[PDB]
Amino acid sequence: MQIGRVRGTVVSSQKEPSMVGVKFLLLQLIDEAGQPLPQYEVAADGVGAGLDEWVLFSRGSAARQVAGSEKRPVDAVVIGIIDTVSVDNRPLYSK
Amino acid sequence: MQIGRVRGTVVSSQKEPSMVGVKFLLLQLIDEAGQPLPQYEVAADGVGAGLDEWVLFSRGSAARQVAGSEKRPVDAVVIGIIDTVSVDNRPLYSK
Amino acid sequence: MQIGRVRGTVVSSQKEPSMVGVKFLLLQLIDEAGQPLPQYEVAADGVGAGLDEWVLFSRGSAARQVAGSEKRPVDAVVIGIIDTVSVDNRPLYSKKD
Amino acid sequence: MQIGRVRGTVVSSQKEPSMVGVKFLLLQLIDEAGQPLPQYEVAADGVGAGLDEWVLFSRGSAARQVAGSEKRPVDAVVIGIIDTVSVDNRPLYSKKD
Amino acid sequence: MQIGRVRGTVVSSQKEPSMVGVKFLLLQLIDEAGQPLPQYEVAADGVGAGLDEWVLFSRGSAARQVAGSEKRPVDAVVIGIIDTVSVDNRPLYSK
């Protein structure tokens, strides 16, 4: 999994029918030190993360494991909103 | 998923027979700021995307989840044509 | 698999229900020369790895193979704490040291 | 999928028995401008591609989807020999040239 | 698949029980002339590769296709020891 910051949304009307009703969040990757990286991922979000929240996300077939997604062509998923990250027994991030 | 721009087409006549009927789009990767990247992906397209359109695409076994591709050796798929990308409540891209 | 060093933990209370009970470790990538890299991975850990320990971790659907995780949306898993790494029949890493 | 150029073959006699019969091609990655990259992949070839031909290839479990490969430990597969690549409706690559 | 040079072994005693009995080889990624690349992989080896030998290895769920590993959390596997790499119909590596 990687840590991402919610930066926005992607909307698509003409799409594979299996993807109807799925919310797409634009996530900015965060590095080991809590700072933005230029990389991004667009991920399905069934949890409900808002702008600027940190999330844990997974890539690959992991994205199909959430209820309803077993046969969706989805390769990235938000699995949780992050409350805390600690590094070397000190807080890096606290929501 | 990542964002790509449709830049062209790949044609193959001598190929695995399980790949017959798949249209191959050449996608140019788009970065966090809506800027073209030197990276590309060739993806199966069952949505019907044309030149210069922005698309959301998935990689890996996600590509086999679309009806008719369950046992094709495909590892990238166009899942939707993008209408809008919003960042921090402002438009980055609008079709 | 890759080698990672345990640098910390990630906690999430609002998450996919399948993920309840899973401990998340922040891993720093270690290279083939035993040096840390500016890359990280957050992995599920059911083996009890502690801070500063080196671990072997797997990515992708490998993460779902451990009993309990078959239908979890996890893509990285700690599979063991490393005791030794040898290169060219010589010690590179020894936990006991 | 990515585009690769066929550079040669890899031969292995001592190998997992499930891999018997599989031809291994060394592929050099091609970039967005049709130029060779330092990166490579070794792919199973059931299509029959020759030296310097451009191919499309897939990675991951995609490689297991062709007849005979369902339970093979293969993670890269040649899926087609490329005849043409177009960009902006104009040729970038034509096999005939 | 890619080409690795066997450089060492990794030993782990505190581990997932499914993984007991698996030999872990430290592989240095190399190109076809044997030049080191800045990547490595720790791979399951059921073939029996020794130090400095060249091997073909696979990543991902491919590693679970070997008998005995169907339900192991393994994501890299040695599939064979390399005898020759021919380029432009000329031998570049010979064992």
The closest alpha carbon to C12, from A67, A54, A36, belongs to: A54
What are the chain D neighbours of E56 within 8 Å (beta carbons)?
10, 12, 15, 24, 42
Handedness of CA E7, E13, E15, E20 (dihedral sign): positive
B77 touches chain D (CB under 8 A): no
Report how far apart, in Å, the C-alpha atoms of E89 and of each of D8, D9, D30, D43, E58 are: 7, 9, 21, 17, 25
Gyration radius from chain C CA atoms: 14
Instruction: Give resolution in angstroms.
Output: 1.7
What is the β-pairing status of strands B24-30 and B36-45? antiparallel
| Residue E77 Cα, gap to closest chain D Cα (Å) | 8
Structure tokens at C83: 């005791």
What is the β-pairing status of strands E84-87 and C90-94? unpaired
Q: Helix, strand, or coil here: D34? A: coil
Q: Say if residues B4 and B41 touch (Cβ distance below 8 Å).
A: yes
Provide the 8-state DSSP code for A95.
-
DSSP letter for each residue of A16-80 = -GGGTT--EEEEEEE-TTS-EEEEEEEEEESS-PPTT-EEEEEEGGGGG-STT-TTS---EEEEE
Q: Where are the domains of chain E?
A: 1-95
What is the β-pairing status of strands D84-87 and A36-45? unpaired
Containing E83, the helix (H) or strand (E) segment is none
Q: Is A80 in Cβ contact with C15 (below 8 Å)? A: yes
DSSP letter for each residue of B8-75 = EEEE-SEE-GGGTT--EEEEEEE-TTS-EEEEEEEEEESS---TT-EEEEEEGGGGG-STT-TTS---
What is the β-pairing status of strands A14-15 and D76-81? unpaired
Q: Say if residues C13 and C67 touch (Cβ distance below 8 Å).
A: no
What are the chain A neighbours of C11 within 8 Å (beta carbons)?
82-85
| Residue B8 Cα, gap to closest chain D Cα (Å) | 4
Cβ under 8 Å to B: D residues 6-35: 31-32
HEC letters along E15-79: ECHHHCCCCEEEEEEECCCCCEEEEEEEEEECCCCCCCCEEEEEEHHHHHHCCCCCCCCCCEEEE
B89 touches chain D (CB under 8 A): no
Question: Cα–Cα distance between D7 and A10 in angstroms, integer?
Answer: 40
The closest alpha carbon to C82, from C47, C36, C43, belongs to: C47
| Residue A85 Cα, gap to closest chain B Cα (Å) | 23
- b/e code B35-74 from CB counts within 10 Å (16+ = b): eebeebbbbbbbbebeeebbbbbbbbbbbbbbeebeebbb
Q: Dihedral angle at the C-alpha atoms of C30, C33, C34, C37, nearest 10 degrees?
A: -30
The closest alpha carbon to E23, from E14, E11, E7, belongs to: E11
| One-letter amino acid of D96 | K
- Tokens 């044997």, residue located: E34
Give bridge partners of residue D86 from the DSSP assignment: B9, D91
Nearest Cα residue in chain D from E45: D16
Within 10 A of B6 (CB to CB), how many other CB atoms are there?
20
Structure tokens at E26: 């430290």
Report how far apart, in Å, the C-alpha atoms of B48 and of each of B51, B77, C46, E67 are: 10, 12, 45, 42
Question: Cα–Cα distance between C26 and C5 in angstroms, integer?
Answer: 8
Which segments of D1-97 does DSSP mark as H helices, in order? Answer: none
Report how far apart, in Å, the C-alpha atoms of E39 and of each of C2, D37, E42 are: 10, 17, 11
Question: Cα–Cα distance between C39 and C29 in angstroms, integer?
Answer: 6
C42 touches chain E (CB under 8 A): no
The closest alpha carbon to C74, from C56, C61, C91, C85, belongs to: C61
C2 touches chain A (CB under 8 A): no
Phi-psi region of D29 (alpha: psi -120 to 50; beta: other; left: phi over 0): beta
Question: Cα–Cα distance between D79 and D85 in angstroms, integer?
Answer: 15
Q: Dihedral angle at the C-alpha atoms of A82, A84, A86, A89, nearest 10 degrees?
A: -150
HEC letters along C30-57: ECCCCCEEEEEEEEEECCCCCCCCEEEE
What is the β-pairing status of strands D90-94 and B2-11? unpaired
The closest alpha carbon to D74, from D40, D28, D27, D24, belongs to: D24
Cα C39–chain centre separation: 13
| Residue D92 Cα, gap to closest chain E Cα (Å) | 24
Question: Cα–Cα distance between B31 and B23 in angstroms, integer?
Answer: 24
Q: Helix, strand, or coil here: D19? A: helix
Q: Dihedral angle at the C-alpha atoms of D44, B37, B5, D47, nearest 10 degrees?
A: -10
Q: Which of E60, E81, E92 sits opposite D12 (nearest CB)?
A: E81
Question: Cα–Cα distance between E75 and E42 in angstroms, integer?
Answer: 9
Question: Cα–Cα distance between B17 and B42 in angstroms, integer?
Answer: 18
- Which CATH superfamily groups domain C1-97? EutN/Ccml (2.40.50.220)
Question: Taking the domain A1-95, which CATH number applies?
Answer: 2.40.50.220
Report how far apart, in Å, the C-alpha atoms of B60 and of each of B14, C69, D83, D93 are: 23, 20, 24, 26
What are the chain A neighbours of B60 within 8 Å (beta carbons)?
60-61, 75
- Tokens 């020894």, residue located: C94
